[PDB]
Ligand binder design. Structure first.
Ligand SMILES: NC(=O)c1ccc[n+]([C@@H]2O[C@H](COP(=O)([O-])OP(=O)(O)OC[C@H]3O[C@@H](n4cnc5c(N)ncnc54)[C@H](OP(=O)(O)O)[C@@H]3O)[C@@H](O)[C@H]2O)c1
Length: 205
């Protein structure tokens, strides 16, 4: 039986916006949690349901996850590189809401640094990476069906749907377009082949 209803967390971010647009265009019934609805567009495809709130508030997350078939996580810290627990605490809330509502599939973005040599993270990105690691741990230990998406640099190239997905962080490039990353998150809703795996999408544009 196929996924029809999804929640997207981080839908207003760079990857989230295009994932949201793609998901709605593809026929999903999409719910988003946003702190600030002005960051959603008017033009283009529109989510079916908007919850205004914060991933750090369990009740807001619970309302967003209720009734879904799957969850996509595209949380991040925008240009804030300071020490942080937002993503991992958000993930804890997401896991608890999934378990409370019977939702068993989550596709969540961290970064290719979690596949590459862990001693080879630029210093300025280490604090954010440490919270990606905490988030990955929360999701992997949840025992839910979890696809770990670990992209390299997120670019602005057009959608292709032609990227390569490896399991080890090696591949044709160190870039994935935001649009292709979103397309891949959606693909993960219609296969089990990546459940319990780490995935590395990349493409030469
Ligand atoms: N940039 C890169 O090249 C790169 C490479 C690999 C991995 N990544 C990782 O990939 C992920 C996606 O990156 P991105 O650039 O698409 O994301 P982004 O533009 O940073 O967007 C972050 C999203 O998270 C939401 N968010 C943050 N705090 C929240 C909170 N307390 N409650 C609810 N929502 C919250 C933001 O909401 P608002 O719109 O309200 O701010 C926004 O929708 C990030 O974890 C990033 O670190 C990035």
């Amino acid at each position: 039986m196929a996924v029809k209803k999804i929640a997207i967390f981080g839908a207003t971010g760079q990857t989230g916006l295009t994932t949201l647009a793609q998901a709605v265009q593809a026929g999903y019934e999409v719910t988003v949690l946003v702190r600030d609805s002005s960051r959603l567009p008017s033009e283009g495809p529109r989510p079916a349901h908007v919850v205004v709130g914060d991933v750090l508030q369990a009740a807001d997350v619970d309302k967003t996850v209720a009734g879904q078939d799957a969850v996509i996580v595209l949380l991040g810290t925008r240009n804030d590189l300071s020490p942080t627990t937002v993503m991992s605490e958000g993930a804890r809330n997401i896991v608890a809401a999934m378990k409370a509502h019977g939702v068993d599939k989550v596709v969540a973005c961290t970064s290719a640094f979690l596949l590459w040599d862990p001693t080879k993270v630029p210093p300025r990105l280490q604090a954010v990476t440490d919270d990606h690691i905490r988030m990955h741990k929360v999701l992997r230990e949840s025992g839910l069906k979890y696809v770990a998406v670990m992209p390299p640099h997120i670019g602005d190239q057009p959608l292709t749907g032609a990227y390569t997905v490896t399991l080890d962080g090696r591949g044709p490039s160190r870039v994935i377009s935001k649009h292709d990353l979103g397309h891949f998150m959606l693909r993960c809703l219609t296969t089990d082949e990546y459940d319990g795996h780490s995935t590395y999408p990349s493409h030469q544009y």
